[PDB]
Amino acid sequence: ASRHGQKGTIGITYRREDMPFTAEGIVPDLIINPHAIPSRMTVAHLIECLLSKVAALSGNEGDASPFTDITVEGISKLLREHGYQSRGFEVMYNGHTGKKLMAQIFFGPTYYQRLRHMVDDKIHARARGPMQVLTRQPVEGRSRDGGLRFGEMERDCMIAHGAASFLKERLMEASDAFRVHICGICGLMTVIAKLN
Amino acid sequence: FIVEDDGHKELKVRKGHIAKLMATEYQDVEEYTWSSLLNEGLVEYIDAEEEESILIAMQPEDLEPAELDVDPAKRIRVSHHATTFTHCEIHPSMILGVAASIIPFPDHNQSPRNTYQSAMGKQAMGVFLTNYNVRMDTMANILYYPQKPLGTTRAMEYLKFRELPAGQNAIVAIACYSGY
Amino acid sequence: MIVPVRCFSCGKVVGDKWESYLNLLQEDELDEGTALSRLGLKRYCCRRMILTHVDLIEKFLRYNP
Amino acid sequence: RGNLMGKRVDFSARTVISGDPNLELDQVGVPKSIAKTLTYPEVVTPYNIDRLTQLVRNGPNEHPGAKYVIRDSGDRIDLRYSKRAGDIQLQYGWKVERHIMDNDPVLFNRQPSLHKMSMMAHRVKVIPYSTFRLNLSVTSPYNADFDGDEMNLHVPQSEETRAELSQLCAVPLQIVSPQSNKPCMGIVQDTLCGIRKLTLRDTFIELDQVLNMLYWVPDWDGVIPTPAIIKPKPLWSGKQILSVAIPNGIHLQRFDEGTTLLSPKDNGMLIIDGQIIFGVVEKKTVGSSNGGLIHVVTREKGPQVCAKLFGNIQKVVNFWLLHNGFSTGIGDTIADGPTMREITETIAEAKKKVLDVTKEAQANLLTAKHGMTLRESFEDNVVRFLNEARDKAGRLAEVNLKDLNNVKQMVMAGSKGSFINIAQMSACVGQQSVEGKRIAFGFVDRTLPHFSKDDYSPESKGFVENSYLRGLTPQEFFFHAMGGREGLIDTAVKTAETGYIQRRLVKALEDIMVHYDNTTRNSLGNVIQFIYGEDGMDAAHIEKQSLDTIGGSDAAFEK
Amino acid sequence: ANWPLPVNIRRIIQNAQQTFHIDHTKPSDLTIKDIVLGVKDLQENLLVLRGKNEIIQNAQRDAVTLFCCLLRSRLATRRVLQEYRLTKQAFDWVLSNIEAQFLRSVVHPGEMVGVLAAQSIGEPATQMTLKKVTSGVPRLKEILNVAKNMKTPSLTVY
Amino acid sequence: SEEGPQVKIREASKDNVDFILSNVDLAMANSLRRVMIAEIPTLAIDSVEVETNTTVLADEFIAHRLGLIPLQSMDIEQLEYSRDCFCEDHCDKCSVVLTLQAFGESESTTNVYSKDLVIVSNLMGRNIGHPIIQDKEGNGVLICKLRKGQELKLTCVAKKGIAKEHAKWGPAAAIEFEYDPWNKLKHTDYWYEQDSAKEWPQSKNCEYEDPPNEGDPFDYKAQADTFYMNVESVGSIPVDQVVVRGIDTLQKKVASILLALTQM
Amino acid sequence: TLSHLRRTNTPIAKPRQLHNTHWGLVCPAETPEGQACGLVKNL
Amino acid sequence: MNAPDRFELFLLGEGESKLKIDPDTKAPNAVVITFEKEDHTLGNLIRAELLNDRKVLFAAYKVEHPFFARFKLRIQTTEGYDPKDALKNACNSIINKLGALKTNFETEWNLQTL
Amino acid sequence: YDRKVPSPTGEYVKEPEWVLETDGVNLSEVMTVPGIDPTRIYTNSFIDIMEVLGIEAGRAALYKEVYNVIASDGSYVNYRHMALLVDVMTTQGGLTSVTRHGFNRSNTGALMRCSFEETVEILFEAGASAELDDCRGVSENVILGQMAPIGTGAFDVMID
Amino acid sequence: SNTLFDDIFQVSEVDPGRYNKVCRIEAASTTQDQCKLTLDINVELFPVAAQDSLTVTIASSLTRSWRPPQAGDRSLADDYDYVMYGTAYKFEEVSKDLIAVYYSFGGLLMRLEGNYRNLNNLKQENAYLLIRR
Amino acid sequence: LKEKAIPKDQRATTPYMTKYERARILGTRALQISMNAPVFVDLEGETDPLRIAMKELAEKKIPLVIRRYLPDGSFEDWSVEELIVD
RNA sequence: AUCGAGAGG
């Protein structure tokens, strides 16, 4: 996730040759979708990319301190002295084609952080599993190889779909299926049955 | 900071005390501390009720009397319109918390996303301390090549985030590439 | 903790430069950017790897064990 | 409530989900390790046994494998352990628990169980990487934007159950929503932006790109489109390749703005026989909305054609967009200096009007509407002035923003962005609203300790002139933070309340079902509706249309 | 004019026009009598409920009334000839398609209506975001609770 | 001279070569550049076994650092891929083995450089596995800095590799491409708030090409024959060799396709 | 680490909402997200 | 964990045919060739040379997924031109051009003095 | 209001209409006054409308109020879904709450009532009641684990 | 193999339109009072002037895959500069004795007027537009 | 209470199979095909039981009686062959 | 287990 509000999973790892290449040849370590930004309404992510590029080419450290007077136009002028676009919009060549991309792509140095949450820890799959004895139900959690909870509201979605048997197999065969003998005369399971 | 009449009502601390503070800071002679400012009385501690009684100015420059081109990009600032200010706040950034101080430009960004980054940064991996190889904590995560942020708040040098960074300055391009 | 070997985007080595660069900024009182130019690390990503990097290894080295 | 209604269930898996454009919408990408963990019992059959022999040979570690074989006696045989597993004979009437295999039905669910649509059956496609993969479109009914979103998959253990999932819970069957009578899934994100850009007449496609896109359509006619322009150079409009993607035999007419048949604005659309005569593709045609192309395709051609169409459109458009590229950029936020000066003058005018109304209030010479306190009237008028000022400022900016800037392109497609986002970044974020009110004086007479006493002026009240790009003054930032805090509280409060509500509604209405007499009855059989929905008809297959007799002149009706 | 409608007639007519490649110059083959009688026959052969009970037949007639009105608006003898030069066969095809589409449109017996209705409220309600009235989730809570107290009671006097 | 693509080199350095390529199909220049990054084979350490590690850096971290260090690959074609080779773990032809043992004797923080690394496997007269140092001091890239009283003992085995498997094996870090600098082809539409010319800098590569006359119409047929490129070499493989090897590797891939068709 | 050390927790007439009194003493934007949002604040 | 090896993309395993050739459906001369363990950079080259040849009506390259390095190219040829023959000629032409460039570059480097 | 009425021609035209909005509701008194149309008048509270005009007017007003909420969103829900809830409250002569008061209290079933709230109290009273549960309800069937007479389960399937 | 209609037109107006490459063209028939044409042309493809006379022809011929031009195989169906292929969205009559013809080529739009050429205008979707200097 | 027969001449129910009915019939037949119970239809090229059940339903080979039910509980029976599928 | 705390959507 970025230092600004936006967070994300990496959908794919792309080799450098595939990734679009500027004339300078810098390949972005990270590619983010444009469509996320306008609804996020965080201009400062864009601002940070611009300021960091200016700072890196100058070598000078760049101050983002809040409530300190900064001109995006001034930073743009500094980028123009560097020769990089005031926008930071960079002409990019599509990697597989070698063709120039029709629309130039924003290219900036963005601070980014690695979130603690990771897939490899998170994933849990249990086809069959240990059962807590009294419930006879699946145990809870990855550590105990536990079965995921089927919500009653989830059950409601299933009823709305109308399939009695999927709900039934999840409800009895998958968890705490049980056979008993109830006495008809008592109406109550007073009966204990020796089958042998 | 305390502001009292002299001629024009001016911040009490003045340039000279700052120069002496910086001289003591460079030394690492006459000793200058925050307690010295308080003994001098230039700076005072104000509780919320006392704050209701006081009238304060964000900017030290705003208190000094104002007597025409302005750059368009500069944020529109209402003139304070107030004759007398008891005190002047040291910096707006000081009201912001440490996690807010981390955010590059909260001033240019929406508040909810600032909150979300504050939440994410505690989760974000960084080297916790130099003692870690000696230490045995139950779970620790350390970045392979921690890199200081390219854009730093003035608050961060006090926060020591630059010294123990939690992020990498990845080159980031905003593009549509096969929908991932 | 230690100077990265290469700029991840470029892949150009950055390990050799660092020591010189530090001495360099003290030797000529040079601004960091001109020192980067002398290093030849022209790509701002190559520059980025050095400027953003800090050596925490010295701090780990201070520990006696 | 927690064990009998809901049970932790076997064969339940969860993963972080990521979206893959190539994968078809009906299919879910299942990480290989989970599929290997997960077993489905398959009875050996004469056709089945020969394949199953090899799958047992490949074993637990490699899929197609089998964790267990089940005897007629049914004492468990553990395959990974078994020495005999090398030498087993498959026998008949013996159930082999297959590793989960591609093109096998499963159920994929986002944790909000608000919707039946949220739990949808998907075809299994086994993928190497660990993340569950899903189409970009199928996100919308799931309501999952997967920055960290985790989704849960349940595998049927019975063939009757598998049949129920495939025959009723499939994504194609759930495309058209029972409620709101509109498709649930539409083309999303870069596919929509790129479909708009491709459809523009200005955009043109060369023959090499045309051939690659033709090839990209999984089913192609094999007949190269006749060039839209032949003689100067063979050129193809983007609409023609997109039309090759459109299922043949489908006709769409759309008129919202003045949509002449000439259609110089190119608003609206005519498709004939899966070939599009005029228009630039916009969100509504390609949208979840009723009268969208997806609704027409799903009803006209059946559901499977619609889902495949989703896929084909996504592939062609994404390829085109990847060739053109897209970047939001800083400069789309930046605004022209002339327009910025007009913007500042607008804000100043609103400020002077607020002061003049305040002065009239100070004079005590005022007109108070009956049933409105005079302070109430003053505050309402001032609040309206500031609201109108921010909206007008944004509108001036929107006109100023050029056709080329990307935020407008995202909005014109309708992919992402809105006028309010444009306005707040461009000119003015507006007055902060707390508890349906302008910012209050926590200190008596002062909104902020910096602010002077008894100030009802907009700056004290916290209406923020400043653009996000321009930057925010500290007071403005604190006001925005107060409003945001209230908003987040209300977000969580609304969720909790909706949970209690939705549960109450479901518990009340669970018993009620259509019956064969078509009476709509509870479990007792008390008839809520003699004919369900007072039409005795499914909510699906109902599209709004104009009734011609009503409306118009009486003379027009007779003529 | 716009109301939820069981079958989209205009789509059927457009599909017919392209399918039969109809020309406007050629006179309609179709008898005026046959247009009127066929529209009436199509109205007759749509059943929300099977069988004949006078109450059941009447409840169906009430049920089909709005759809019948839509069909009469969509196909008038004069309108049938003017809007399109329907071959008599294309009109018969339109009739068959309309009947079949309505039959598909009828709810399959046994679908659980109430759970669907509750979810159908719920997702808007989850997404539901909050001249002054009780609004949104609080207003909905008042409606559902049937509480006597109203935060903003109001009477509309006409 | 030869009919077909003709290349004129603007600049020759051991690190980098800047050339102008004419009468080339662009897809071929892109194909060659992607081959040049990925397909060119080079030797880097694929296995590191550490006897003892006292340094603060973890062994995996050190091993990674070692993997990135440049190893000379002029004779890498003579070397055989280990998976191709008959030996078990390593034969001397497939594997070049480098050992380093460093103890922090110095009170001053010890420094471990690429120059300290030494080879224990017979060269057999091929110039392979020598650490390459461009430093004026000749001080190698620092794998680790050693505290006084700290000793790290490791052996490293270097196997043939390709960049598609891992980034370290790729010989060339940066490759610069410029085509249609004047935008006569108009492949890309510039984003300009007011004027395109002021917002986008003129490329130096524009200057070589004659500026387009305003009167002439845009021609749909034309595809740019001339591209301006520059290659940057680590120097594990020299620049001239690097570009020739990229060309040759593409030829080998094409020949494999042709032979596969003949076998079919 | 630093942020966890400076924390305020309010047991539980609108405590969550930012107050004018809160200005200059509490971070405007650092708050729990989810249930008990705004009850807990960082100085 | 679940992720596949870089080498698996790199090299053919389990006796994968490097080239699979199957008839196209609905175009008479067209044929589809599945390159296996092959990357984009060769495929666009083969296709460009195929486009250059007058006789091939259709040439396109498509990859089903980025995950797996399988590349599909479809060629439709004029009548009297075998598709496989067309592919051979295009590939040989690429090789000739590559050799010509290498020789010209070698001469140029010898001319270069640095 | 600015409501639209038929023209003499019959083209729908719009006439400005004068209206009054009242803070309080006293429906019976307001309706028996001059200068108002008794037919047109409406009360935002559904219960007052139901008491003055009967249950069916109350159900109409209930759907109208739910519709106003959904319209404030701009969302649209098909009339059948809202209608079913309104009719469930309406079919019982008194307007019936979604809350446990009333909805759980409706006699039919024992387990369907027990699931929502006050489970054990319901079961205790039922034990004293000696209530017989058909177990026809979906939630009841889930508790049994027996296949519910729901969707696919409802119709019996027999051999030829 | 007969052109369905041939016309000589003088273009009244060039409109740049929303799209820069494709400009709208407003044109009046020469020697006919009642024939009017509104076309979408590509200015990059075709030089245009505010006043200009261009020959306009519609042909049924000179499905089938577009075959790449082989110069020996190719006989120019036309020496005309500009050719488009497309389908009429509608044939209408603005007035009695005044047929209006609407032809679209990949979304590019064409308006034609008069009943002298309506017999020349045909129901079949296929059309080739030929524009000559 | 008992023998709540619905005359075969006097049945009113939707002739079309409920989608739930088709799903249950197809799944039951597929279970039988997995059970390896004899399949009447000629089968070409499908292992899967569900595909076979679908073909058998289109053939109408599947003999099954679906008891259309009413809230009263009088039982009307529609043979699979009788019920229209489309 | 239990209870708590914290965190993700």
Ligand SMILES: Nc1ncnc2c1ncn2[C@@H]1O[C@H](COP(=O)(O)OP(=O)(O)OP(=O)(O)O)[C@@H](O)[C@H]1O
């Ligand atoms: N319904 C929506 N309409 C418009 N934009 C949206 C919507 N939902 C999310 N976005 C936008 O998508 C991006 C990421 O989603 P966002 O940050 O809102 O997630 P979230 O609200 O935390 O998620 P969740 O819906 O799971 O609670 C942001 O730009 C956000 O504005």
Ligand SMILES: [Mg+2]
């Ligand atoms: Mg999310």
Ligand SMILES: [Zn+2]
């Ligand atoms: Zn008993």
Ligand SMILES: [Zn+2]
């Ligand atoms: Zn670099």
Ligand SMILES: [Zn+2]
């Ligand atoms: Zn070997």
